[PDB]
Design a protein around this ligand. Structure first.
Ligand SMILES: Nc1ncnc2c1ncn2[C@@H]1O[C@H](COP(=O)(O)OP(=O)(O)OP(=O)(O)O)[C@@H](O)[C@H]1O
Ligand SMILES: [Mg+2]
Lengths: 49, 385, 48, 51, 54
């Protein structure tokens, strides 16, 4: 069980779609992080290891 | 060996003959007629298109029309015409409409619906005339109210009193209130309605009050009847949801139930049975006495009553020579009738555990201690001691 | 009269820069194309 | 040749109208059956030629 | 186990026969809706159904 495409007039399956769209978003902001200076590599590395 | 053969002598020949008889007759029905009835049928099929959209008849206007409300969103002024009569219909009955231009083309339903199907049952009752012992007295109170008007109405007329309508079974779980109603129903040979009160309610709105009507409507067509609306607690005072999606549904559905029970007339010919956990899961007034007679409070088997339940079970299992009947009772303290059946299932599993084909002494003793341990309190004798 | 009425949606979620899934206000979800009369540099998720 | 006829065949049936699915509630003696379509009303509708 | 064993299968076949008997029975019911005073209603019935009036 997954998402699928039906055509509008035929109302029959002609194509398939990922199940990754038609749900909620994978990343609410941008996929790459905003901070590229970092304050996680600079700031508490020890804890981060 | 000899008598189970006698059951086979009666059932095999009569039953096997009955299947075969139906099967030839389906051909044989056809052959007597070859015109008239055939002709009329032929033109019914020309008239009635394929498919037919279902309708529900709201009301008949006397002039060769009517108004239906259909699962098609707008209502229709339909006409009554072609192989149907004005008096072959009654309001609130389900009708068949013509796809192209809606018209009542006849009825082949007459209150045929899925909620009707769940409600009517062709099943065999589990108990017949109190197969399992205990609660001797409580059944001689259901019977006075429910079975007794159906069997002899005359006796109430000499008495000059109106005859009772309905019973309410309530109180304890595991006491087989839902099974006594099944017993009483088999004894009379009445029409039984296993509908459950909880099967009218769904998230989706506005469906429910139809369902409440249909129960009283069908029950009266096949009267005499016994109606059991089992588990009318859920539709009680309580609410569906505290947000949304059900603020209305319970409120309409319950109210609508009380109304068509009273509105019949005060009958002693269609009985109702309300099975409920308590009156604390329902509204504080129902509908509310003089009208709903009688109320039956189930409480736990006493030493006499629980003996009776037990003797039934123990005899259907291997041995009883090992540990006296009395010694089982003595060891047990007072509990519902489920706890008595539970000790016997566990006993049987213990004979399997050993890999015996006898329920030995050891099996009885363990099975008794197990149930008591669930289901426990000790501060009755701790306050005291 | 010749303009002809239109339907509104909102972009439910990007699927490609070619194809986009819209959630119709009329009802069902659809996958619709884009024309050259709309900018796909300004179609983005959750734009009406 | 078989490969072209089959693709045309896939295409053909998409141009033909859709199909549905219900469950029979009861049987009628007019040579019909009563079907209840799952999101939709009841219908009494003629039966297939093979049953 | 011959006294109960053999007689168990015999019990079972009868029940299954009874289930089958009920599906033979319900596929044919009582004919039809045709009634002689509403066969005369059919004369008017063809005209209105095909017409644009209901
Ligand atoms: N008088 C009686 N009639 C029927 N069974 C009885 C009787 N007295 C006791 N029993 C015993 O009680 C057992 C439990 O019955 P059951 O569990 O169906 O209860 P209930 O009160 O109808 O419950 P629920 O609240 O779960 O709907 C029966 O299997 C039987 O062993
Ligand atoms: Mg019960």
């Amino acid at each position: 069980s997954m998402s699928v495409a039906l055509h509008r007039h035929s109302n029959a399956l002609v194509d398939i779609l990922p199940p990754d769209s038609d749900s909620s978003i994978s990343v609410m902001g941008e996929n790459e992080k905003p901070d590229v200076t970092y304050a996680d590599v600079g700031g508490l590395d020890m804890q981060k290891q | 060996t000899r008598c189970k053969l006698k059951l086979l002598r009666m059932e095999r020949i009569k039953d096997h003959l009955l299947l075969e008889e139906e099967f030839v007759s389906n051909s044989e029905i056809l052959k007597p007629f070859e015109k008239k009835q055939e002709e009329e049928k032929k033109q019914l099929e020309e008239i009635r298109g394929n498919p037919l959209s279902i309708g529900t008849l709201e009301e008949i206007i006397d002039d060769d029309h009517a108004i239906v409300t259909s699962p098609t969103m707008p209502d229709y002024y339909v006409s009554i015409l072609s192989f149907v009569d004005k008096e072959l219909l009654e309001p609130g009955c389900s009708v068949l409409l013509h796809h192209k231009t809606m018209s009542i083309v006849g009825v082949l339903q007459d209150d045929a619906d899925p909620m009707v199907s769940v409600m009517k049952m062709d099943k065999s009752p589990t108990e017949s005339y109190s197969d399992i012992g205990g609660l001797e007295s409580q059944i001689q109170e259901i019977k006075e109210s429910v079975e007794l008007p159906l069997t002899h109405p005359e006796l109430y007329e000499e008495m000059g009193i109106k005859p009772p309508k309905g019973v309410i079974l309530y109180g304890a779980p595991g006491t087989g209130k839902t099974l006594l109603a099944k017993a009483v129903a088999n004894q009379t040979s009445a029409t039984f309605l296993r509908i459950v009160g909880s099967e009218l309610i769904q998230k989706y709105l506005g469906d429910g009050p139809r369902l409440c009507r249909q129960i009283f409507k069908v029950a009266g067509e096949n009267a005499p009847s016994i109606v059991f609306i089992d588990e009318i607690d859920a539709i009680g005072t309580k609410r569906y949801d505290s947000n949304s999606g059900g603020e209305r549904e319970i409120q309409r559905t319950m109210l609508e139930l009380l109304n068509q029970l009273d509105g019949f007339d005060d009958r002693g010919d269609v009985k109702v049975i309300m099975a409920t956990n308590k009156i604390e899961t329902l509204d504080p007034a129902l509908i509310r006495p003089g009208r709903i007679d009688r109320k039956i409070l189930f409480e736990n088997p006493d030493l006499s009553t629980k003996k009776k339940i037990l003797g039934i079970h123990t005899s259907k299992m291997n041995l009883s020579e090992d540990v006296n009947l009395e010694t089982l009772v003595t060891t047990k303290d007072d509990l519902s009738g489920a706890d008595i059946q539970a000790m016997c299932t566990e006993a049987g599993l213990l004979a399997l555990r050993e890999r015996r084909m006898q329920v030995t002494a050891e099996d009885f003793k363990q099975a008794k201690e197990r149930v008591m341990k669930n289901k426990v309190e000790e501060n009755l004798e701790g306050l005291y001691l | 009269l010749q303009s002809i009425g239109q339907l509104i949606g909102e972009v439910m979620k990007e699927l490609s820069e070619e194809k986009y899934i819209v959630k119709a206000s009329s009802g069902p979800r659809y996958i619709v194309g884009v024309r050259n009369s709309v900018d796909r540099s300004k179609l983005k998720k959750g734009v009406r | 040749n078989d490969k072209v006829r089959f693709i045309k065949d896939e295409l053909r049936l998409l141009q033909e109208p859709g199909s549905y699915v219900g469950e029979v509630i009861k049987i009628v003696s007019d040579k019909k059956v009563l079907v209840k379509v799952q999101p939709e009303g009841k219908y009494i509708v003629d039966v297939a030629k093979d049953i | 186990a011959a006294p109960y064993a053999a007689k168990l299968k015999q019990t079972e076949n009868d029940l299954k026969d009874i289930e089958a008997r009920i599906k033979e029975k319900a596929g044919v019911k009582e004919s039809d809706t045709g009634l002689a005073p509403s066969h005369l209603w059919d004369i008017m019935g063809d005209r209105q159904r095909l017409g644009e009036e209901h």
